[PDB]
Amino acid sequence: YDLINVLKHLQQIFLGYQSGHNVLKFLTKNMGELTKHYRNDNNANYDKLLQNFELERQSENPNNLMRQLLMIQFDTETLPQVLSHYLQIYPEVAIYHLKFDINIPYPLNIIISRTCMIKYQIILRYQLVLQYHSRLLDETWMDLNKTPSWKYRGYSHTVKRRIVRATRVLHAKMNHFIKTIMEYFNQNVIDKEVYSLEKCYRNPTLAVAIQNELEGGLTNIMTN
Amino acid sequence: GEIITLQAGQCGNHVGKFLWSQLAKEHAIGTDGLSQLPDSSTERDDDTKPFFRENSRNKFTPRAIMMDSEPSVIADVENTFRGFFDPRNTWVASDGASAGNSWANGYDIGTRNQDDILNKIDKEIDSTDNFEGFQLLHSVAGGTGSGLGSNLLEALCDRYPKKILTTYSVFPARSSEVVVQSYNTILALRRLIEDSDATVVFDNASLLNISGKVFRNPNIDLQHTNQLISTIISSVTNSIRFPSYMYSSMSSIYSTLIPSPELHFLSPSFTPFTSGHSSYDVMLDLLDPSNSLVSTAMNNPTYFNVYNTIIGNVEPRQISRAMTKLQQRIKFPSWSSSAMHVNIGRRSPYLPLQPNENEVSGMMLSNMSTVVNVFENACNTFDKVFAKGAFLNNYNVGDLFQSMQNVQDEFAESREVVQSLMEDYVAAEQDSYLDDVLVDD
Amino acid sequence: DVPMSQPLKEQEVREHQMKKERFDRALESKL
Ligand SMILES: Nc1nc2c(ncn2[C@@H]2O[C@H](COP(=O)(O)OP(=O)(O)O)[C@@H](O)[C@H]2O)c(=O)[nH]1
Structure with missing residues (x-):
């Protein structure tokens, strides 16, 4: 079956394993409609994004069956709302409701259980939303440093301080914090799990142990 | 996200050929444009696309243009490697000449024929998928740098106002010619300062100090150290070429490297290797000024921004411990509360970690x-x-x-x-x- | 007897497992 390639593909899909260019590719164009869905009704033109994704699936690798089987659905419930059922996660006392899933054939479905798919789905939504916001901030930085209105001269120190430097000081702090979180999540959480799984393929003796680790890692991520 | 490299004179083209060779090796893509990888698989874990164009016959050439005022330098690279270059995208100066190693020389070639250098650049952009910012390498003071490199930045700002301009700056005159080259350097910097978005400086002293310690021929200065510098300038795209997740593009990195763009020049620090160990030590080893690329007496500088990518047999627990010197050793950005940022792994699979190796290498850069x-x-x-x-x-x-x-x-x-x-x-x-x-x- | 706590690692390990199970059970109960 080549389960290793299959799981590597699954990791490429939901954990962003070696997928930085794919997440940025996903955001490319799509961010334009993504910002509208929490500013619209459930009658929103979800189809436009779904078509963009379908078109990407047309322009796809013939062997990467895991991408071929990948689909996007929309919920009405955004991450913090759906996550309200988790005992450790507190609700607001709502931005994205985009979710991915995969239809798995029985030879694999017995491994790739619905429980792991749900965990993969929710983990990816976290990763995507964080990447989304991180990207908006990065593009904002480039807009700041490209746009002529942001490069004014000879007005006052009051404005150079209150508008330009103030923007850069806040922007940089926003950037340092959001990026450091992303770095943590990958470096000290996801990389460990991908690594652990690689360790478990070192001439494993038990199918179950592998299954337990797949679930193990997903929980380790979710309880972080 | 495609990158086109503009190579100015001997600086740009010699380092360029040494770099494309280092990349030819890292991707097993071939110094002659022919993949060195077996045909046993149609799948890859790298991404050559942004730097190399794949032909219909699975042959490859770099996304680069060699600079026009120095056709003998262009020929050096195009003829030595040839199969791994595409000369049809190369502009050659309209008069076949370079009127001195000066700002005026190349600047005038550029302003007179701005349209022709741009037509070659612009036509190549149309052949690629989503062009990502321009990459330029030059001697700030030289004819191709102070002159044409300066003109390119001006030309690019008006033709491609929506794209990122990133450059590599190498050290100014190393001799008494500084009484001339320093004027060219200054005019060049005016343009570099006003037009680029980001850059970096590579000091001669490190090329030579490293040369003295790494080559068994310590009399090597700018030639051959160009390969040492090309392994230094590899860290810039490894996260793209051997893709990662954390920092995979230009817009996603520059906001982290230099939040305040006027101070557009970074200070690299790198441990050389042939083409020690622990994540803990490779990170810490780069805080030592002797491994920096702008070495000086300021062993107690302040920092505005520090960033590092470590590639190899990485251990996150060691990274956590290395952080102790972030807290103890970096004079704080009392003016902005910045902190160090990192990225990890993605050793080229075609130049894998060897058995019994736990070594890592990587690049630290900072806005100092x-x-x-x-x-x-x-x-x-x-x-x-x-x-x-x-x-x-x-x-x-x-x-x-x-x-x-x-x-x-x-x-x-x-x-x-x-x-x-x-x-x-x-x-x-x-x-x-x-x-x-x-x-x- | 001495009014003392049982060992700490064990207390934390139990907390980790209970937290992991709390999570897992949030899902096992429907899935
Ligand atoms: N690091 C490095 N510096 C160089 C090299 N070639 C020239 N330089 C430096 O570049 C400056 C002169 O620029 P050069 O490229 O030779 O002149 P140009 O051809 O007119 O652009 C001086 O600071 C030289 O030390 C090289 O291969 N490597």
Whole structure:
């Protein structure tokens, strides 16, 4: 079956394993409609994004069956709302409701259980939303440093301080914090799990142990 | 996200051929454009696309243009490697010439034929998928740098106003010629300072100090050290080429490397390797100024921004421990509360970690205050000679030809722009520089 | 007897497992 390639593909899909260019590719164009869905009704033109994704699936690798089987659905419930059922996660006392899933054939479905798919789905939504916001901030930085209105001269120190430097000081702090979180999540959480799984393929003796680790890692991520 | 590299004269093209060779090796893509990988698989874990164009016959050439005023240099690379270059995208100067190693020379070639260099650049962009910012390498003072590299930045700003301009700057005159090259350096910096979005400086002393310790021929200076510098300038795209997740693009990295763009030049630090160990030590080893690329006496500098990518047999627990010197050793950005950022892994699979290896290598770069030692050399030199009448009156080409008045004004205004860069390096480390930004708000 | 706590690692390990199970059970109960 080549389960290793299959799981590597699954990791490429939901954990962003070696997928930085794919997440940025996903955001490319799509961010334009993504910002509208929490500013619209459930009658929103979800189809436009779904078509963009379908078109990407047309322009796809013939062997990467895991991408071929990948689909996007929309919920009405955004991450913090759906996550309200988790005992450790507190609700607001709502931005994205985009979710991915995969239809798995029985030879694999017995491994790739619905429980792991749900965990993969929710983990990816976290990763995507964080990447989304991180990207908006990065593009904002480039807009700041490209746009002529942001490069004014000879007005006052009051404005150079209150508008330009103030923007850069806040922007940089926003950037340092959001990026450091992303770095943590990958470096000290996801990389460990991908690594652990690689360790478990070192001439494993038990199918179950592998299954337990797949679930193990997903929980380790979710309880972080 | 495609990148096209613009290679200026001997600086750009020699390092370029050494780099494309290093990449030819890292991707097993071939110094002759023929993949070195077996045909046993149609799948890959890398991404050559952004730097190399794949042909219909699975042959490859780099996304690069060699600079036009120095056809003998262009020929050196195109003829030595050939199969791994595409000469049809190369512009050659309209007069087949370079009128001296000066700003006026290349600047005039550029302004006179701005449209022709752009037509070659623009046509290649149309053949690629989503062009990502321009990559330029040059000697700031030279004919292809102070002259044409300066013109390219101006040309690119108007033709491609929506794209990122990133450059590599190498050290200014290393000899008494500085009384001439420092003028070119300053005019060049005016353009680099006003037009680029980001850059970096590579000091001759490190090329040579490393040379003395790494080659068994310690008399090596700029040649051959070009390969050492090409392994240094690899860390810039490894996260793209051997893709990662954390920092996979230009717009996603520059906001982290230099939040305040006027101080556009980074200070690299790198441990050389052939083409020690622990994540803990490779990170810590790069805090030592002897591994820096702008070495000086300031063993206690302040920092505005520090970033590092470690590639190899990475251990996150060791990284956590290495962090102790972030807290103890980096003089804090009292003016902005920045902190160090990192990225990890993605060793080329075709140059894998060897059995029993736990070694790692990587690049630390920083926006450091005390980097004036690679700029003041020109600013505080050309001006004392300039004040007595410019020493470049034998380069009266184009704008310096049109009037002696332009000669003196271009040099003086450029010095003021450079002086702003020097003033900004210093002002930036003062707490009072930015505290008033949010207090009076 | 001495009014003392049982060992700490064990207390934390139990907390980790209970937290992991709390999570897992949030899902096992429907899935
Ligand atoms: N690091 C490095 N510096 C160089 C190299 N070639 C020239 N330089 C430096 O570049 C400056 C002169 O520029 P050069 O490229 O030779 O002149 P150009 O051809 O007119 O652009 C001086 O600071 C030289 O030390 C090289 O291969 N490597």
